[PDB]
Structure formats: C-alpha cells, structure tokens
Design a protein around this ligand. Structure first.
Ligand SMILES: [Mg+2]
Length: 380
C-alpha cells in the first residue's frame, strides 16, 4: 500500500508510465519519474494528470549527458535511499532513451525489484523480472483530456427526440451519399447564407426550388421537424439544425455511431465531438479542432470528417497525420471520413502516411468500418 511505488523514465511519449497507475488493480499510488532538467515540463504535465487522481509524483533528475556510469551512479543513490526506507519499488521500463533505460535496469535489477514493460501495440503489461509474474492487459482509463495534457495541449469540450432525428437523418444521407451529393452542396450554401446573415431563414431562387436532390433534403428536414419549407422559404428551427445542414451532420453521425459501437466495445474508453485544442508557444498560439476524438486501448484515435472535396497541393492529410503525432504520440491513430469521392492520389497518400479512410462508397457501412478500425487498436 503506502510503501508501494513505481519508478519510470520520462521520454517524449510517456503515456505508458501513467496508464499502469490508472488501472484499478495497481496498488502503487506514487511514482518517481527520472528525467533530465529539460524534461521538467513533461514531468509537470504528467503530474497534472496523476495528481488529479490523488496519485503522487516526484521528479529525480539525472545528468543530461550520455555518460552512463554517471547515470548509474545517480540512480544507485536513489535506489539506496529507496532501499533504506523499505520502499517496494516496481520499475516501469516502458519508456525512456535506451542508454538511460538500461542504466536504470542494471541498478534496479540488482536490488531484486520487479520490472515490467507495457508493450505499446498489445497494451499488455509484461513482467521482465520475475518472469513468473502474470502479464495482464492494462485497463482503459485515461481520457482525451488527459491525453492532451500529457502532450502539451489543452482541449475544451462541448435533446433525446432531436438526437434520434439528427441521427436517423445522418444515416439516410450517409447511406445514399453519392445520390445526394449535389443537393448537399446546395443545402450547405443555403445554411451558410443563414449563418452569414445571422438568421435561420433563407429564400431559395426559383432555380434552387426546382433542384431534384435538394428537395429530397428539404423534405427530410421537414419530416424530421428541424425545418419548415414553405413558398420557397427554408427556416431552420435553430442554430444546431442550421449547423447540421451546413455539414456538421456527418461528424454528428460519426460521433453517434462511435457511441453505439462503444456499448459493445469497452476498449473505447472515451469519445468527444468537436474538441477545441490549444497549444501555447510563448505569447503565440496554435488552435486545432478534433471532429470526433476517442481513446481506444489507451491509444488516441482522431477522426476528421469532410463533407467537401479535396483540392491541388491539399494539406488535409499531411495536417491530419501531423496532429495525430503531436497530440497522441507514437501509438496515436487517425482516420478521414469523407462524404465526397477520394482521388487516387489521396488514397495512395493516406496509405503512405498510415491514415485510415472511409469514403462515400463505404459510408453505408460506417458502423462496421469504424468497428474494424477500433478492433485493430487491440486490447480485447
Ligand atoms: Mg534510444
């Protein structure tokens, strides 16, 4: 209980030093992170997440050079103080540069303290010493919010009859996506006119009033009781209905589908819609939005939804991959869900970058393709 502690080596992706302490089966409620002076900030972030849970933390600084007899010396001093107290040390060897990792391993192994690693792909906690201990699957407890904090960012986060109408409307549009293509573009332009004018009504031109697919859409809005359409005037009942017709329908559907899959897939441990993400650089800031964000098997999964086509020096896929890396580190995964067809360029490019895709053809199987993507996270 009180004497049980973890020791871990900070690196640039230290999530696997936190997830063992969040697992309800772990006795230890204290960890000492070993790092160099420039990793104080990573320490502070790690501590924000763990301290929230009343898990306590300390930072023990090794010298920053590559001299390993000096590292082993610093760590043996630490070990000897821990040994003198009767601390029941467990060494989490999941993280850290290999020179520091193996120096700490030598020291801790000589004290006969248990040593384990979370294999990042399987998420299994594996006992390196003593091999007799039983490996377990790390529980899935960390949130998106915690994930962002760890990686130096901060997120800002967010009926029943309305929700179901918005859900079923999305299903219809997703499953007839190619049929509805052009019409949803015109609806997007109409919703955008309302947005720019700050109103919920818009008069259609006579040409717009004769468009076949648009009219299919207008009458869906009407049946769903989220707009009225009378004498060429389209009125949304509210801003959320206007945003929905503007194109937020697809991310709403994806969020709603993830929530359905999660009822039977406990590895999906967190989910959110339109997370605002902030990162400070001195006085400056970079702001991003995550259309649907999840954590699954302790790995951050981001889904970008597009309802318009990709340009043409397009940045969508380079940017998505870049967010993935920077917000969830090496195990993070990302998907683009696209209402419009994807050019082969962008397909080949998504493959090159390791980004998953769901296009219009597969939108009628959204729930299955999403399940498959989430199963591939492991953890079951
Ligand atoms: Mg290394």
């Amino acid at each position: 209980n009180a004497m049980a502690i973890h020791v871990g080596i900070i690196d640039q992706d230290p999530v696997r030093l936190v997830t063992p302490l969040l697992d309800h089966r772990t006795v230890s409620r204290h960890i000492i992170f070993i790092g160099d002076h420039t990793q104080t900030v990573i320490y502070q972030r790690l501590s924000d997440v763990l301290n929230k849970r009343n898990i306590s933390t300390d930072f023990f600084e090794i010298p920053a050079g590559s001299n390993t007899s000096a590292i082993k010396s610093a760590i043996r001093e630490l070990a000897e103080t821990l040994k003198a107290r009767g601390e029941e040390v467990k060494f989490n060897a999941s993280c850290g540069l290999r020179h520091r990792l193996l120096s700490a391993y030598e020291v801790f192994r000589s004290y006969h303290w248990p040593i384990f690693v979370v294999e990042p792909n399987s998420d299994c906690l594996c006992w390196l010493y003593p091999e007799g201990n039983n490996d377990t699957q790390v529980q899935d407890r960390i949130t998106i919010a915690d994930y962002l904090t760890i990686f130096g960012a901060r997120g800002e986060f967010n009926s029943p009859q309305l929700d179901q109408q918005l859900y079923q409307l999305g299903e219809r549009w997703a499953s007839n996506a190619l049929e509805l293509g052009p019409g949803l573009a015109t609806l997007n332009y109409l919703a955008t006119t309302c947005r720019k004018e700050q109103k919920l009504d818009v008069e259609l031109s006579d040409k717009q009033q004769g468009y076949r697919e648009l009219n299919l859409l207008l009458s869906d809005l009407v049946e769903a009781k989220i707009a009225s359409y009378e004498n060429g005037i389209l009125t949304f009942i509210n801003e959320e209905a206007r945003r929905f017709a503007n194109g937020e329908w697809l991310e709403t559907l994806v969020h709603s589908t993830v929530k359905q899959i999660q009822d039977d897939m406990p590895t999906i441990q967190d989910r959110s819609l339109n997370v605002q993400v902030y990162r400070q650089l001195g006085e400056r800031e970079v702001r991003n939005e995550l259309d649907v964000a999840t954590v699954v098997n302790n790995k951050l999964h981001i889904i970008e939804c597009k309802t318009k086509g990709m340009r043409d020096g397009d940045d969508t896929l380079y940017k998505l991959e870049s967010l993935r890396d920077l917000l969830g580190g090496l195990q993070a995964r990302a998907m683009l869900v696209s209402f419009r067809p994807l050019r082969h360029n962008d397909i080949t490019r998504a493959e090159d970058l390791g980004l998953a895709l769901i296009g219009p053809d597969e939108l009628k199987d959204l729930k299955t393709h999403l399940t498959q993507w989430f199963k591939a996270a492991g953890g079951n």
